[PDB]
Amino acid sequence: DRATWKSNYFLKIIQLLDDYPKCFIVGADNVGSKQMQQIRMSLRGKAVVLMGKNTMMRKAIRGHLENNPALEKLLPHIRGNVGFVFTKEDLTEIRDMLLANKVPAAARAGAIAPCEVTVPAQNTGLGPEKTSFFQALGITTKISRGTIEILSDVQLIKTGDKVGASEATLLNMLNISPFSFGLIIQQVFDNGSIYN
Amino acid sequence: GRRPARCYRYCKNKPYPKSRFCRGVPDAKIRIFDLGRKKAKVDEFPLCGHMVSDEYEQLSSEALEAARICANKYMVKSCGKDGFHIRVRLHPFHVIRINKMLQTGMRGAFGKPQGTVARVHIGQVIMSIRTKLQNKEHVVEALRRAKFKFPGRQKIHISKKWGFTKFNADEFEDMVAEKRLIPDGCGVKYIPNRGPLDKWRALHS
Amino acid sequence: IIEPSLRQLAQKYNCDKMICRKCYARLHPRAVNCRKKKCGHTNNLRPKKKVK
């Protein structure tokens, strides 16, 4: 049950700080479960990424402060959905792999937009049967060669706007979605030292 | 067909059973009294819930079967088709009478047998269900929705007895391990320290 | 003929309600007990039947 789950989590965070003296305090903000499964399974030989209740990691580290007092610098740097990357491999190669493994996620029907979604004026591959998904946004379309030609560029979703459920579907069926979410690393712990 | 059951409700008359003197009694329509996986051992249905009456009244033999079907139909949905045992523990014996009018009047008044009814004392187990100890709320809800078929007032009490036995649950497996009572189906047999000694030898052999 | 966020604005006031089984009254969507004393603040509610 949940009590022995917490007590096992204490053990599997005690031994993962007794093993690796080198850590990343990385923000797992709004990444997918499979988009973390890809990175976790890909770096399995070369990293161990860990998450959990931050108010549980506070007391899990304070149960080690009996032994290693250099872990106190981790405590003010656990706020928000932030977790651990444990390794004995590198200092910047797996950093660049964290930077390079981030995947452009699909446009959620209600997520905030970080960047200026627009569509280039082009001939898509949808076909004439699927014009009503452009008519819901008011895109002036033309049928050529059995597909749909978007005549002009459309600024449909701008930076810092709500992504509508109607205007999120045509991004999915045009198979372009600029929302690349990944790991947003901000605090490094390496042998009792912190760098940005 | 039959008159409303608010008429034949209180235990007014003497108990007047189907006998040599009262003949021609029409049969009470409850005839299956216990069901479920009634072919089971005592070890595998420990838990038991009783619908206990709290009025001295008469429950009709039709209401008994209605409540039995309502308590069965819930647990074939809930506990699977062989995860319980309902035993209705009120067989109806009191036949009730009817003076029907067609003009003679009240003269020569003694009723024909109409139906059979069960006279229920204060604090008496009407129905009882045994099942696993994990199906506790299923017994509670099944007896609750079977309460609405009876008139009057019933409470729901989950007993301390191992199933349909008269022995307590905290002592049942102890006494089985001590070989003081042996299983024979729905119930157990209690062995005293009083028999001839070959019956002691035959169970310790 | 109508735009979808406007029809959702209209139907949160017209459609998206609860309706009580007894007394037939109209309640807010997160309702558990009826408002009317005429039904005894009863507990059995239903949603409003959506249009087809």
Partner: protein, 190 residues
């Protein structure tokens, strides 16, 4: 159970000058003054702190049916502070399937004539409340803006013109027309 004491302080901001005449409060600031007598509510309103920074409502020996009226008083004082600092802008949009709802504003924000609702020829003349200024907003095609100080006047003058536009004897689930309250914000922001 009578509890012995319930209280809840309300931080009034810097620009608001609040005073209280016995139990009747007066909140003054940029946009005007609001007065609302609580002479039904049977509490202790005390304006503690010099610089006069907090209002404090006390209830002594109250069961829960009258302890419920403490954050009620606090929320009326907070909506009384908000409508004098920031104001109350209720925007409300006219949803129409076929016939356009033609709203014209008369008596410089105090009367709303609603025309052509479902093609009907009866015109809805709805008077506003004293302190509320209706307007047809620019940069949005059919949106009414109700601005004022008292939230119980702004919202009631919204609900009047919303209940003036109802269907009769038809399926309300399909004839989804009328003016409906869309956004409940402040007039100026912070």
């Amino acid at each position: 159970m009578k509890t012995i004491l319930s209280n809840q302080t309300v931080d009034i901001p810097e620009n608001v000058d609040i005073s209280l005449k016995g139990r009747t409060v007066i909140v003054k600031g940029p946009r005007g003054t609001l007065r609302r007598d609580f002479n039904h509510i049977n509490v202790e309103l005390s304006l503690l702190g010099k610089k006069k920074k907090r209002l404090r409502v006390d209830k002594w020996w109250g069961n829960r049916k009258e302890l419920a009226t403490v954050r009620t008083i606090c929320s009326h004082v907070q909506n009384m502070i908000k409508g004098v600092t920031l104001g109350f802008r209720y925007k409300m949009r006219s949803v129409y399937a076929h016939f356009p709802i033609n709203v014209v504003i008369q008596e410089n924000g105090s009367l709303v004539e609603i025309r052509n609702f479902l093609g009907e020829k009866y015109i809805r003349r709805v008077r506003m409340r004293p302190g509320v200024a209706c307007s047809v907003s620019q940069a949005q095609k059919d949106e009414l803006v109700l601005e004022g100080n008292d939230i119980e006047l702004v919202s009631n003058s919204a609900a009047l013109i919303q209940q003036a536009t109802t269907v009769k004897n038809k399926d309300i689930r399909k004839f989804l027309d009328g003016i409906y309250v869309s956004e409940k914000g402040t007039v100026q922001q912070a």
